RNA sequence: CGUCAAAGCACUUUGCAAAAGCUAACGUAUCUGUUUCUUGCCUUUUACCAGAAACAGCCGUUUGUAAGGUGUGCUAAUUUGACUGUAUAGUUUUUGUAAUCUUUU
């Protein structure tokens, strides 16, 4: 399967493991075993925060997932106009009769 | 100005406006719906695909979306800032002949000649409603609120439907011949519509009798759809014939502006958003944009 | 519309009254789906027909044209069938006449 | 008077749009003729004496201009030894002023290289148990005589054509179709026709 | 050798089969070789006869000459051009080509007789026809294809059984005249329109 | 699977790690695996308390390893299809 | 199509259709060789009429009396016994009793199209019934 | 082979567009002509000899796209794309070493 998972490719993540400890950041690999691959990542433990990287986690380790923010960031045809003119029909009455 | 533009091979039906007043976007027996500019007034896509003639074009009120109602069943949708297919709302058993939308761009309402109604979600591919009558269906309006959605058929009754509901609530009267083309006011408060008998009537949305029979703008042999707009104010209306003639009525019924122009059988008037500008298509292959100073 | 004002020329005969693009009369351009004009020509001559046969024909209808067919049916020759050359059975095909 | 109604709609919508309609008529694929009703002009108009086809006359020149390209189509299909007659396909002149072969005779390689090593294979072969091998005439009808008539020929029969002796056991696999005009049309050996 | 132009496709024979004029059917080769055969000798006739030149007469292998004898004033109206005289010579071809295979449906000549016939008609051209007189260059095309017969000849005739006709390995010598073809035609309808 | 080849590409460069020990492990990396093995040289631990350490040769067990830490210039690195017939992501010109 | 001695044979049912398509060659080329007599259009008229009668007959013998082997009838189309061309339109409904293949081009028409033949009698008037000029149709239309 | 998406499908007729983008057979084929020059054989010019450069025609080829035709299916068949495509309860991830308590700030 693995439909879902790719929906969620290159989307910053908010990841809550099995020590408690909360990952965030994109998403860039993903795998059968749900080792994530995280880009800028920041723990969260609890009024705290720390900076590491690229940050490769395992399957065994990770609880739940969780979508942050949303996923970072005929020419010309035939047709010509022309001016004006208006022209006056002599007859009146539709189309088609006469 | 005046502006007579020439680009189609055949009979062209529909022009319209964007809801910002930007572009025109036009199509009709082509099997090709040409984007315009409005102020230098040039071509832009040639969106290709639709495989039976378009009978009608709306923008999606994102100016970005745009949906046709081919000869052969398909409502197709475009994105005009690229100018890629989305989809094939793939449905009726026979050929459309009306479109229209709402605020919410999501839903659009569908006319066939199976004598089917159908509400459509721009999500789904498919219908959501089917309001099935008896004779074959030609013009439909659906209201601001997103909720009356009026239907004009062979019999010369306009019939007034809710998405609540779903029952036959009001059905308009003294009309004695074919609708070709409903039309909702920028209030939501009273309709237009272009019979055979060249009565161009309007009538109320919600005691529900007439207002202003309109007299002067005959149909014939031909059987085209002809259309009618109502203007930015909604002081004035804007209804073709298939004398050559487009005849500007003054809302009190009186008859303002008859210009002529056209060589053929006129189709679907439009007035642009804001600055006063004649949007009038003919089977010509001609459009004009007639202005007042 | 702004009309001319005058006198009026009075002496202007018959011939010089109409506006002609072309001597005998105006012509002008037309865009009437061609459809609309061949049944439109179809109608006008069997009213001419009719003059001259003098006859109206009754009203165009339903069911009566499998009436009008069958009329027009019965008197006409049957087919002579496939693989028959010589008659006495023969092969009439829509070749076959009335009579 | 409802039922009415629609039925002159509906009918007015079909000329508009209408299935397998174009502007307003039905299209259609110019579908060849009989092979007889070519053969017929030839006869009748002859070598264009009488006033019946005085009109023609004119035409007739007019396709002078035009003829060494009937003869260019004509030779560029020319039937090869190995065949005993060959079919073609034409452009005639409903006036019967000319005729354009409209075929390219369209070979696939190795196997026409194969045939025409197999002609220089019985053609050394034959030249050599002959002994009196009787070269052609030339003008091979004589200047007054006038040209032969087509129903004449198609009565004939054909008579064989060279050829090999294919020996089923070893030369299987080519031996039901090594002597076709195009060879395997049929197969999904080829594209189509 | 120019690496070629870049076009959208003309294709004349494809246009004359979409007016009402031309007519398509199918049928055997020899039949349509004679059907050219004729045409272009009424071609001609109308075109001697509508300049009233009508004490000359074509016989019907493609040979022009004189009745009456002339006066020099006589003469001078005659005196046909370096067009008609080579359409005229390519006609005179057309007709062996296809009388020799006319005849092999009789049964008077048998194939390996026949594909002999065709390999001396090609490469004996300047001699059963009189068309260099009127083309010069024609002479190169004539040259090549004695050329042809040299490295044939050489290679097969030998072997143990070599002297006299047989061959008829004609494919390139057959070769050397469309190609020519391929040239004239553009140039001859200039000359003929 | 790239979240394995990201590791074997890390090879040379200096990684963090954490086990379920508690403790975090810092050094140049020299071999990896798909079982998620690894190979270290020079490693600088510091356990749950701060104790600081120096161990010259290391082996470990995947199983044991909960997260790495991987330097910067390694997310520009490639992201490869892969195959249902490939063990390795490597790029691919082949059919699919 | 000329088959010979010496040649493959046709499939086994053919050879009690032989007489039956020897008696259409057999007339036909009575029209070829014969002149005609009216108009130079006129003249042409009889190959049509002819040429529709031996496909009638292929066309019968597959799909009513069912006389014939598919391998057959296919050998006959592949051999120009019977036009599929029009066979073809025979199945479909419209032109169930159509004539020649030329009166249903719009493209031949001076302006518009069909063969007046191609017309259900009931419109047209008494005295343009007449026949057509192409093959001496008289009432193609599939009814009337 | 498997999934998903799109589309009727195979075969065919015309129309309309294109076909060095980084040195390369649109065509493993190959013919005529015009102009400008150079040499041949020559005096009637044409018709030609055999080299060059510059232009042209003609016989063909491929692709995309539009509309059609025949046969088959539109209660199906075929094509086309796309894909992070495999099944493992017994040691390196998805059938648990978990559960529970207490003290310090």
């Known amino acids: 399967g693995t439909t879902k998972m790719v929906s969620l490719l290159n989307h910053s993540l908010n990841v809550t493991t099995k020590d408690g400890r909360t990952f965030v950041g994109q998403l860039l690999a993903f795998d059968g075993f749900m080792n994530l691959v995280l880009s800028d990542c920041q723990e969260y433990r609890h009024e705290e925060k720390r900076m590491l990287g690229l940050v490769i986690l395992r399957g065994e380790f990770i609880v739940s997932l969780s979508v942050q923010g949303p996923p970072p960031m005929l020419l010309s045809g035939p047709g010509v106009a022309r001016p004006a003119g208006r022209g006056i029909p002599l007859g009146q009455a539709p189309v088609g009769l006469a | ?293 | 519309v702004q009309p001319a004002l005058g006198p009026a020329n009075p002496f202007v005969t018959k011939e010089q009254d109409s506006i002609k693009n072309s001597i005998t009369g105006y012509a002008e351009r037309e865009y009437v789906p061609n459809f609309v004009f061949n049944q439109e020509y179809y109608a006008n001559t069997h009213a001419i027909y009719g003059k001259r046969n003098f006859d109206d024909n009754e009203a165009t209808t339903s069911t009566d044209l499998k009436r009008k067919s069958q009329k027009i049916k019965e008197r006409r020759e049957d087919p002579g069938d496939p693989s028959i050359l010589e008659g006495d059975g023969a092969y009439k095909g829509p070749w076959a006449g009335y009579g | 008077q409802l039922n009415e109604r629609a039925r002159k709609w509906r009918a007015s919508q079909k000329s508009k749009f209408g299935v397998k309609r174009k502007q307003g008529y039905v299209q259609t694929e110019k579908a060849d003729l009989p092979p007889e009703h070519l053969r017929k002009i030839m006869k009748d108009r002859g070598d264009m004496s009488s006033r019946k086809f005085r009109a023609d006359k004119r035409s007739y020149l007019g396709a002078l201009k035009y003829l060494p390209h009937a003869v260019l189509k004509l030779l560029e299909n020319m039937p090869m030894p190995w065949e005993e007659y060959r079919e073609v396909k034409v452009l005639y002149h409903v006036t019967g002023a000319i005729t354009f072969v409209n075929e390219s005779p369209r070979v696939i390689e190795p196997h026409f290289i194969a045939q025409w090593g197999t002609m220089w294979m019985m053609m050394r072969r034959e030249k050599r148990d002959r002994k009196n091998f009787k070269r052609l005439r030339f003008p091979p009808f004589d200047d007054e005589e006038p040209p032969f008539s087509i129903d004449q020929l198609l009565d004939l029969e054909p008579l064989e054509a060279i050829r090999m002796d294919l020996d089923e056991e070893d030369d299987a696999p080519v031996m039901d179709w090594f002597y076709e005009n195009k060879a395997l049309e049929d197969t999904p050996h080829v594209n189509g026709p | 050798m120019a690496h070629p132009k870049s076009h959208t496709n003309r294709s004349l024979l494809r246009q004359l089969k979409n007016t009402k004029f031309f007519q398509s059917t199918s049928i055997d080769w020899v039949e349509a070789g004679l059907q050219v055969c004729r045409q272009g000798y009424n071609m001609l006739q109308l075109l001697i006869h509508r300049k009233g030149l009508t004490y000359l007469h074509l016989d019907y292998n493609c040979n022009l000459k004189p009745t009456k004898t002339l006066t020099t004033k006589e003469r001078k109206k005659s005196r046909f051009g370096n067009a008609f005289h080579l359409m005229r010579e390519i006609l005179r071809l057309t007709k062996l080509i296809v009388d020799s295979h006319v005849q092999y449906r009789l049964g008077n000549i048998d194939a390996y007789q026949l594909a002999d016939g065709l390999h001396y008609i090609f490469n004996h051209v300047g001699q059963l026809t009189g068309m260099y007189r009127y083309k010069y260059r024609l002479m190169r095309q004539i040259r090549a294809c004695k050329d042809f017969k040299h490295l044939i000849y050489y290679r097969f005739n030998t072997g143990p059984v070599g002297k006299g006709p047989g061959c008829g390995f004609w494919a390139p010598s057959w070769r050397v005249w469309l190609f020519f073809l391929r040239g004239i035609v553009p140039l001859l309808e200039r000359w003929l329109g | 699977s790239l979240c394995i080849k990201l590791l074997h590409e890390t090879q040379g460069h200096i990684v963090t790690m954490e086990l379920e020990n508690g403790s975090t492990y810092r050094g140049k990396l020299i071999e990896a695996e798909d079982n998620m093995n690894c190979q270290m040289r020079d490693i600088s631990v510091t356990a749950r308390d701060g104790r600081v350490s120096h161990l010259d040769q290391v082996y470990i067990r995947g199983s044991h390893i909960r997260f790495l830490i991987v330097p910067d210039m390694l997310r520009n690195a490639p992201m490869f299809k892969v195959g249902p017939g490939r063990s390795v992501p490597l790029p691919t010109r082949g059919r699919r | 199509r000329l088959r010979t001695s010496r040649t493959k044979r046709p499939p086994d049912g053919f050879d009690e259709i032989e007489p039956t398509l020897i008696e259409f060659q057999d007339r036909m080329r009575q029209i070829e060789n014969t002149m005609g007599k009216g108009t130079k259009t006129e003249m042409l008229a009889p190959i049509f009429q002819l040429h529709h009668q031996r496909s009638r007959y292929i066309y019968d013998l597959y799909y009513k009396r069912e006389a014939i082997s598919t391998e057959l009838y296919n050998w006959l189309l592949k051999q120009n016994y019977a036009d599929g061309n029009l066979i073809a339109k025979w199945k479909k409904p419209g032109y169930e009793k159509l004539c020649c293949l030329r009166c249903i081009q719009t493209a031949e028409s001076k302006f518009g199209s069909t063969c007046i033949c191609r017309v259900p009698k009931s419109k047209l008037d008494k005295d343009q019934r007449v026949r057509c000029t192409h093959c001496g149709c008289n009432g193609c239309a599939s009814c009337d």
């Open chain 2, 1 to 293: 100005p005046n502006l007579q533009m020439f680009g189609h091979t055949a009979e062209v039906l529909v022009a319209r406006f964007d809801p910002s007043g930007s572009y025109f976007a036009s199509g009709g027996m082509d099997r090709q719906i040409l984007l315009w500019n409005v102020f230098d007034v040039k071509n832009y896509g040639v969106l290709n695909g639709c495989k039976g003639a378009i009978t009608d074009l709306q923008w999606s009120r994102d100016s970005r979306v745009v949906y046709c109602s081919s000869s052969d069943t398909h409502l197709m949708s475009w994105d005009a800032v690229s100018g890629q297919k989305i989809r094939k709302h793939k449905g009726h058993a026979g050929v459309v002949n009306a479109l229209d939308v709402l605020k919410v761009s999501e839903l659009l309402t569908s006319v066939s000649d199976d004598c089917t109604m159908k509400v459509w979600d721009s999500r789904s591919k498919d219908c959501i409603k089917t309001i099935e009558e008896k004779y074959p269906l030609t013009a439909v309006a659906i209201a601001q609120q997103g909720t009356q959605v009026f239907i004009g058929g062979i019999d010369g009754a306009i019939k007034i439907w809710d998405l609540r509901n779903n029952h036959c609530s009001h059905v308009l009267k003294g009309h004695k011949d074919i609708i070709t083309s409903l039309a909702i006011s920028k209030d939501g408060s009273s309709l237009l519509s272009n019979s055979m008998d060249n009565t161009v009537r309007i009538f109320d949305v919600k005691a529900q009798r007439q207002l202003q029979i309109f007299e002067g703008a005959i149909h014939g042999q031909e059987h085209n759809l002809l259309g009618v707009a109502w203007s930015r104010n909604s002081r004035f209306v804007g209804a073709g014939s298939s004398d050559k003639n487009v005849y500007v009525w003054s809302a009190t019924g009186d008859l303002r502006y008859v210009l002529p122009g056209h060589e053929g059988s006129v189709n679907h008037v439009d007035f642009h958003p804001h600055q006063d500008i004649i949007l009038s298509c003919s089977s010509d292959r001609t459009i004009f944009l007639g202005e007042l100073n």
